[PDB]
Amino acid sequence: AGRIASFLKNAWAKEPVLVASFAIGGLAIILPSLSPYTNYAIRINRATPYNYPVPLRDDGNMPDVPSHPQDPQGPSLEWLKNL
Amino acid sequence: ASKVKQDMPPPGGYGPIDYKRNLPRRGLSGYSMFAVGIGTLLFGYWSMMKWNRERRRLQIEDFEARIALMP
Numbered sequence: 001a002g003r004i005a006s007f008l009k010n011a012w013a014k015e016p017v018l019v020a021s022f023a024i025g026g027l028a029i030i031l032p033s034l035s036p037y038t039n040y041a042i043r044i045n046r047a048t049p050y051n052y053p054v055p056l057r058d059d060g061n062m063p064d065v066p067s068h069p070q071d072p073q074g075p076s077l078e079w080l081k082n083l
Numbered sequence: 084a085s086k087v088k089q090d091m092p093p094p095g096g097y098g099p100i101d102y103k104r105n106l107p108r109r110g111l112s113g114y115s116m117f118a119v120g121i122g123t124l125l126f127g128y129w130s131m132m133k134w135n136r137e138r139r140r141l142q143i144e145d146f147e148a149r150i151a152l153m154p
């Protein structure tokens with residue numbers, strides 16, 4: 001804890017470029033695991049409709065599937081408009 | 084038979100002439116420049132975040148228009 005501080009000071013005095021590079025790399029490595037918006041990015045990626053949604057045949061036993069796009073059932077994007 | 088006239092230095096003496104190196108300091112500290120750079124980076128990051136989220140919503144809208152028109 002005392003020799004490494006001196007090593008850090010010497011590196012800052014001799015190779016500032018390497019100090020900055022290593023700090024940036026470590027931050028980029030560890031920050032994404034501690035961020036709450038990573039799952040938000042995943043959800044945004046999952047919400048982009050690249051292909052056509054093929055409808056399902058009504059067997060009369062799917063209350064959770066809407067019968068029209070404007071019905072209350074199905075997923076919602078209201079979380080995205082507040083972002 | 085007038086007085087001797089010759090090129091000579093003026094009465095008393097010529098003004099002192101500078102010769103030493105003169106390079107003023109003329110700069111801010113490193114801390115200030117690093118702080119300004121990091122602040123600019125953070126401001127840009129936040130502005131880009133807003134704009135990119137808006138662009139994602141716009142892309143979703145256009146994709147939905149295509150989905151409506153596909154059949």
Ligand SMILES: CCCCCCCC/C=C\CCCCCCCC(=O)O[C@H](COC(=O)CCCCCCC/C=C/CCCCCCCC)COP(=O)(O)OCCN
Nearest residue numbers: 008010011014015018019020021022023024025026027029
């Ligand atoms: C943790 C994530 C890692 C990934 C991020 C980094 C991305 C890429 C960066 C690495 C690229 C390759 C590294 C190159 C290594 C150089 C080796 C070397 O020989 O170093 C000497 C210099 O000596 C040194 O090793 C420099 C000091 C030690 C390395 C630099 C710092 C290491 C890490 C220090 C900071 C750690 C994190 C920052 C914390 C900040 C503290 C608050 C080079 O000088 P010469 O060319 O030989 O000079 C010859 C002319 N006389």
